[PDB]
Every structure is written in structure tokens, then in C-alpha cells.
Design a protein around this ligand. Structure first.
Ligand SMILES: CC[C@H]1OC(=O)[C@H](C)[C@@H](O[C@H]2C[C@@](C)(OC)[C@@H](O)[C@H](C)O2)[C@H](C)[C@@H](O[C@@H]2O[C@H](C)C[C@H](N(C)C)[C@H]2O)[C@](C)(O)C[C@@H](C)[C@@H]2N[C@@H](COCCOC)O[C@H]([C@H]2C)[C@]1(C)O
Lengths: 64, 76, 51, 96
RNA sequence: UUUAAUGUUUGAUGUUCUAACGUUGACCCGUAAUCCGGGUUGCGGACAGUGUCUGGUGGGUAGUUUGACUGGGGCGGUCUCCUCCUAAAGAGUAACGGAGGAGCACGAAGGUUGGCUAAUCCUGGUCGGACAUCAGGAGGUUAGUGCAAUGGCAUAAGCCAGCUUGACUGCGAGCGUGACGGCGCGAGCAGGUGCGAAAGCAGGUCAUAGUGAUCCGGUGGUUCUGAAUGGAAGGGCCAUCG
RNA sequence: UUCCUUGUCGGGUAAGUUCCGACCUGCACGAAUGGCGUAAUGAUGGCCAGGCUGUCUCCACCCGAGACUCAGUGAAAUUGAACUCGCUGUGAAGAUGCAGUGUACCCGCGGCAAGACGGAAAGACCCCGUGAACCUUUACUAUAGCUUGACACUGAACAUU
RNA sequence: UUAUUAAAAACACAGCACUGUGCAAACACGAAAGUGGACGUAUACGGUGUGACGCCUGCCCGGUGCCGGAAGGUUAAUUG
RNA sequence: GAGGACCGAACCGACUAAUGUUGAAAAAUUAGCGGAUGACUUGUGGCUGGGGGUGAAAGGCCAAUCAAACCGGGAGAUAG
RNA sequence: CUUUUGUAUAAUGGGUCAGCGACUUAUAUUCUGUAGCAAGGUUAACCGAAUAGGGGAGCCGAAGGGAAACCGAGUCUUAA
């Protein structure tokens, strides 16, 4: 049988050009009044998955 | 009553020692107070982190009438 | 645990708003400040409203 | 994805975005594919007949990829400004 | 102006009625049968009872949960964060090792400009006293810092006044620190603003605690999407809440 | 039923942590999850006395059945391999096997059980497993049953309003 | 009475009490039909506790349960 | 001539001790022991079925089997 | 032999011999080697005196950025 994608991972990681994965930052869903604007601003752009975590992502997204 | 609590270490101290070449913005020393003071081409962050405002070599000096330690960047 | 969260709505037509805290027991008066509105790119006055 | 009980990476990160149903019916065409077509004039039907785009493609865009050498008449296709120059440079013609 | 009573819709019940329905009353027949069915009759009677829906009750029954650390386990204590020591003069470093704190506060206790400099004690002095306010000398920070400790602080970061909202929006060279999620510092650039004559300073507070991922959902916005098409619903994006 | 506790006093014995009687200071009795009595009953618990005795001081002899020898038949558990001594030390910390040293001709038979951490049963204790079962309850979530009302099966007349 | 380590002070018991039950009884076994209760009818039957007999059985209804009450508050489906 | 009366065989039971414990025996033998007209015992046949039965109640018993029998199946359950 | 910080260990397992007895298979996916072809590569079902040939439906690759519309060797971010 085909490998099944972890659908939860597919909704959180997008494959980039050179094979990396981009993802949205955490800590930007709720309580935000107490967070400094500088901190919230640096969490808006998408980030690349670190080298230590690529093994977990690739295993979960075999067809990505 | 009972002990057993502590906080995580903060990794303070000197990051670039005398003579080291640094880029602009490099953190030189993290400190709680101003154990070291900002000299030439060196800024003082809100937590009194001393960072290089220009490229060059860091330099430690003791100056002033209170013999305070200053850190400056010999621009090169 | 007394300070309540409030929002400051811009006096301009835009729905932009800031958020802050306030001790409504000691300071019952509404908070009014001049803050930058990034929609109209001007410093307008912001008035208090419920979160 | 199991990390021993710690909240795994694909669960401690937020979900984002949505899937566009229009992107599934849109394709990109390289300049090097304009010569594979039959007849010179290219459109949706001629590209599908040449097995260049899918049968369900409704929108197609020509981009500056590869190279075109013969005069080609592009019809009913969006063309990037870089590909538009290259097509006109080879005596081609672009019509909406 | 108002009031009564005959006529009506819907309820609100009840006292009658019989025709549904009940009859584990009697009698007759199927039938040489205490089942059952039919018939006659009596007694009940729109009740009871059953179906669907619904509230309550429900260890009668069922499926399960009931943490870890730990000088064995239990009991007690502890579980996140901050400060000091242990820690061996970079960083880091354990124990149910030694000591303490935090789960906030503040539209001023923030910004800026201008100014200012303590503790304690002595001497003199109405009430006035060991201790109030006044004056002088000594003293030199032994004081102060919204709160623990440590490191800082006179150019004061301490104290006072004026004017104020930079407790700005978009960004960000370059670093620091983490396995990671993350967290931290940041000159400079654009837009707009405050204070100052100006150089300048300001992206909260002397610094380090004051905190909670994701999912789901709410509220506002939105030259994004809109399952034939136009809308809409829903979704996305931005801000924010639980 | 009393922890302290062999409580204290009395009785019994030369001597009684038990027994019987009392005291009340009931750690922590108590009135139908009964209280206190109670003749009779008991393969019931505790204690005393007479009788009786090899229960004992302290064993002796005897009669039988085995054990032992001969003939016939003929098992079992167990078993890494063995050319399978003592001691002191050492050492996965209690040695037939290591070190040092002592002793010891080779092999049976009858006996005895100190050791071979002897045999037997993948410890019942204890802990552990995000094991199991069954049981409990004001743990959670359900649910049979019980119960409430609405609608249906289900109609008429009339009051009361 | 623990067949096969427990025969007992445990269980039962006659007696006592409370409580349910008006007969198509309560109750029990049954998706139901039905059957037991009982071819019985409150001097009967079921459940619970106690346990011959003798003398007796005190106080507490706050908690939990049960019974009664129906005014008020709250409250489901339904209705819209 | 009454009695869940008395003594005591058959019969039913199982209190004590010894033996046996790779037994003669997967619960017995030997010597004593309890009941022995009764809530007695026994034969033949029948009925009750597994979250069920039955239980003078020990979680006892339900074919040397019981805090949920046995047999087949899910099934190569799962086993950090 | 196993298991362990550590076993002559008096920790586990084996009386002996002979036979049997444990990293497989299928389908996906990634990487390495190797072979073919190469900006292309390859067919699946199916047809077929069928391992040929046909079949290019498809799949992967030659373009990315953005949540998306969209733009495109750039794109997103932002008023820039
Ligand atoms: C009559 C013969 C049976 O053994 C016994 O009866 C022994 C007296 C029995 O022990 C009795 C008596 C007892 C006092 O031990 C002496 C008691 O502690 C143990 C639990 O039970 C053995 C020793 C008793 O063994 C003791 O078990 C305990 C738990 C640990 C002891 N030792 C390792 C310390 C060990 O010696 C075992 C467990 O009974 C022996 C076991 C191997 C077999 N099973 C038992 C079955 O009957 C008993 C019920 O078991 C569930 O039968 C055993 C073995 C076959 C025998 C050998 O047949």
C-alpha cells in the first residue's frame, strides 16, 4: 500500500525550492497584549525548519 | 522551610576578549550591571549588554577618576 | 490580578486598535492617547473601548 | 513523528494557509514547449493535444524558461513580460 | 366616556356520554379444550396502556481512569519561573544540598528638558516628648531603587518640576543562547511623533521573575478565496480574546 | 473489646504474663449491625482437681512388618563437564575447582544428614508494567429499569374561565 | 458450611420488629407472550435487620435516605 | 406412647492422632469421633447454563476445572 | 552461554545425540551502487500464436515565490 501522509504535518509545512520546509512561528495565536510588538513582529514571517528537525518532517511528509 | 529551588543559568560574561576582531553589532559582554562601561564605538543595550557599533578589535581599558573598566572598538 | 485588558480604538475611520491594561478601580477615567495609525499613517488620538 | 511524549514538531506549530482550487487548473508553459505544438498557433486546445498541459487545465501562462526560435502565435494565454519580449524577438505574435 | 350579556378562535381545567381502547367478569360457539378466536353482555373508558421525543433517578449493569520524583514503596514534601552559594577565577555543571522570591505593579512609577543630592548623629530651638517641623556642624551614600537576591547606579539608574505619549508602525546589518519549539540584544533605514535653543534622546520601566505550545472557538478589519454563474456561507490573511 | 499492661487487690500454686473474683483509670463497652442475664445443649475456647498412665525423669526388653543377604523382575526425580579433600586468605563480597599450606594408597558395603547457597515450582512477600481480573463508592462516562411531560393511537356534549 | 489444610463464636433457626403489598398484589424470570408468587387474598405474601427464653431496649431528624406537602423559586421536549 | 428425645450397629458424616506424601489412593488407611424417626438418608428420572445457575452464605459448587466453566472461533490479541 | 558496573561464581540456561527451529514476503518511499536513455525519462490497465510489438491514460523532471488572487528568474514582505 502507498505510504500515508501525516495530514496534520501537511497543514503545517510547505516544501521550499532547495528541499527545505517553511513553517509558521509559534506563540502568535492568543494572549498578545503582554507580548512586545518587536517580539510579535519577528514571529510574523515564515521560518525554515532547523537541521535537527528535518528528519522528523521528511518522515511525516513522504510525498511533499 | 525547604530548599531545592534554583533558576536557569543565564550565560553571562565576556563573549569577545581583548584583541578579537568583531563585526558591527557583535555582542561583547553580557552583564547584569555595568561592570564594564561602554567606550568608543560601543553601545549599551537596555539590559546593559555591550555591543560593537563598528568593526574592529575590542579593547579593554581602565580610565576615569573612579578607575572604571571601559570597552572600546579600535576601528580597523 | 486586578488590571483588566482594554483596547484603544483610533478616532480615524479605520478599525485599527491597540491593546493595553488598566486598573479600573483607581483610574475610572477613560484613557486617551495620541498613537500612530498605520492605516492612515498619521498620529491620531486613540480612545478607550472594551476588549 | 513520535518524540517520546514531548509535543511533536507537527503539533506544536500552527496550521496556516488554505488550498486554492484554482491553482489545480492552472499550468505554466516554458518557451521551449512552444515548438512542440502543432501548427504554430498555440492555445489551450493545441497545448493539450501536444500533451504539454493537463486535460483539466483552464488557465495557462508562458514564462521565460528555455528558448523559442520560430515565430509563434500565442492566443488566449497569459504571458510574462520576459516571455513576451522573447516571443516578439523571434517574430512571434501575442493576442489576447 | 364606560358597563353588561347572548354569538366565536385558541387555550385553562372539571362533570356527564360512548363509539376507540382495556377486561387475568359472566354466558354462547368453534370444541369431547381453564390456550386462543369470534359472539352476547356487564364493568371500566378517552383514562389506562404502548410508540417516538423529553427531564429526573439509576454501582442494577458496563467500559474505564485513579501521575512522577523518591537512598525500596507508602506517608510527608516536591513538579514552572527568578536571585545567591555549592560551581573547582570563561560558559555550563548534580543531590529529598544551603538560603530566599515570583504567578505582579505603573498613563506615570513611561519619554524628554531643566534642576537637585542621602543615612545617621551632634548642637541650639514654643507646645514637642528617645523619635515630628526649624537652624547649624559632623558625616560621605553606611541612603535611596514599586518587590527577593545579586550585579549596578553621582554624568546619577536616586529626588523634584515643566511639557508630553517613542508603552510609535514597517524593517533590520550583526550577534548571544538553546536538541528543538524558542528566548534575548541590536546599530541603522523608511514613515510619522514628543521633548530640547541645539548637539541629541525616546521602539516602555537600573537589569535579571510577573508565565502556557497546538487544536477548537469568539470579536474587528481585509484592492485573498467563493464547488455552474452573480452573491452569500465558510475558509485564509491581519489585529485581538478564551 | 484495655494501648500503657504481667494495671491493682483478692483466690488458687512452693512459685500462676493464663484462670476465677473484684476495682473503674471504658487508649477505643452499650442497648434489635441489640444490652445484660440465662437452665439445657457443644468432636467449641480458657482454667483447675481426682483417677490414670513410658508424656516425662530415662529408657529397657520383647512380638510382628520393613531395613540387611540370596534368587527373579525392575522404576523415579536429577544431570555443562569432572581426575568431585581440610584449613586460612582471596574473589560478583559465605570456594571441591583461585593463592598459600596441610593432609590423603585404589574400590566397595551398611549407616548419619553438616555442605554441594542440595531437588521440586520463570517468589505467593516487595517493587515495577502508562499489565489483568474481580469488588466498592457521593471517581468519570454511559446504560437497563423506574419515573415526568409533549405528540400519536384519541372521540362527543357541557360547564368553569 | 470452605468436595481436597478452617466445623467454629460463622450460616440457619423458632421468636421479634420495621416496611412493602387490595389481587391483573408487591416482587422475580422473561425484548414479549407468559410463568412463578398462588389455584394463595393482609391471621396472606415479599423484602430487611435481629436471633429461644428472662429483664429490657435511653437521648439525637442537624448529615444521608425514605415518607408527606404544595404555595413560591428554578427547570426538558414542545411552541415560535 | 409424644419427641428436629437418649445409648448404639447398618447408613450418612469427618473432630483428633499416627501412617502415607515418586502413596495401595490426584484426599485414603488404622484407632478413636458426630448424627443415627429426621431441617434424615438413598435409588431412578427430570428441571435450572456462564455475568448465568444454585448456594442453612464458604466466593462455596456448576464433570479431579471457578472472584466468572468447558470447546471452537476473532487469533499469529497485545507484551516499552 | 546469557545478563551485567562486574561472574570460576554458590546468578540464568543446557543429561547426551540426531533431525527441525528465528530478520521473511508484498506494496509504497528515500538513499547508495550499477545499467539504459538524457532536457528528457518511462509507460499502467489492456490488445497481442503474448517475455516481442502496440498502448504515453498518466507519473517524475526541466521554476520559483506567495496563505491566496497573482506575478514569474524572480517573488514575498511593506506606503516603499
Ligand atoms: C506433600 C508434598 C508437596 O509439598 C508440600 O506439601 C510441601 C510441604 C510444601 O510446603 C508446604 C508447607 C510449608 C510450611 O513449607 C514447609 C509451607 O510454607 C508451604 C508453602 O507449603 C512445599 C515445600 C512448597 O514449597 C515451598 O514453597 C514455598 C512457597 C517456598 C519454599 N522454599 C523455596 C523456601 C518451598 O519450599 C510447594 C510450593 O508446595 C512445593 C511445590 C514445588 C509443589 N506444589 C505442591 C502442591 O501442593 C501445595 C499447593 O501448591 C499450590 O505440592 C508439592 C510440590 C509438588 C509437594 C512436594 O507435592
Amino acid at each position: 500500500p502507498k505510504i500515508k501522509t501525516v495530514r496534520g504535518a501537511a497543514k503545517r509545512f510547505k516544501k521550499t525550492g532547495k528541499g527545505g520546509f517553511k513553517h509558521k512561528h509559534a506563540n502568535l495565536r492568543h494572549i498578545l497584549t503582554k507580548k512586545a510588538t518587536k517580539r510579535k513582529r519577528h514571529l510574523r514571517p515564515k521560518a525554515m525548519v532547523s537541521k535537527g528537525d528535518l528528519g522528523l518532517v521528511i518522515a511525516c511528509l513522504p510525498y511533499a | 522551610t525547604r530548599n531545592g529551588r534554583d533558576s536557569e543559568a543565564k550565560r553571562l560574561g565576556v563573549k569577545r576578549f581583548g584583541g578579537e576582531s568583531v563585526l558591527a553589532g557583535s555582542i561583547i559582554v553580557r552583564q547584569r550591571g555595568t561592570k564594564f562601561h561602554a567606550g568608543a564605538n560601543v553601545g549599551c543595550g537596555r539590559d546593559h549588554t555591550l555591543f560593537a557599533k563598528a568593526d574592529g578589535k575590542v579593547k579593554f581599558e581602565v580610565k576615569g577618576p573612579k578607575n572604571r573598566k571601559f570597552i572600546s572598538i579600535e576601528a580597523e | 490580578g486586578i488590571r483588566e485588558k482594554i483596547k484603544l480604538v483610533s478616532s480615524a475611520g479605520t478599525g485599527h486598535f491597540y491593546t493595553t491594561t488598566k486598573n479600573k478601580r483607581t483610574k475610572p477615567e477613560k484613557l486617551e492617547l495620541k498613537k500612530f495609525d498605520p492605516v492612515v499613517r498619521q498620529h491620531v488620538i486613540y480612545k478607550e473601548a472594551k476588549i | 513523528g513520535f518524540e517520546g511524549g514531548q509535543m511533536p514538531l507537527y503539533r506544536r506549530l500552527p496550521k496556516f494557509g488554505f488550498t486554492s482550487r484554482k491553482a489545480a487548473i492552472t499550468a505554466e508553459i516554458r518557451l521551449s514547449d512552444l515548438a512542440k505544438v502543432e501548427g504554430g498557433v498555440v492555445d489551450l486546445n493545441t497545448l493539450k493535444a501536444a500533451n504539454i498541459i493537463g486535460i483539466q487545465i483552464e488557465f495557462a501562462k508562458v514564462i521565460l524558461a528555455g528558448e523559442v526560435t520560430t515565430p509563434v502565435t500565442v492566443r488566449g494565454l497569459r504571458v510574462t513580460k520576459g516571455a513576451r519580449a522573447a516571443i516578439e524577438a523571434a517574430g512571434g505574435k501575442i493576442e489576447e
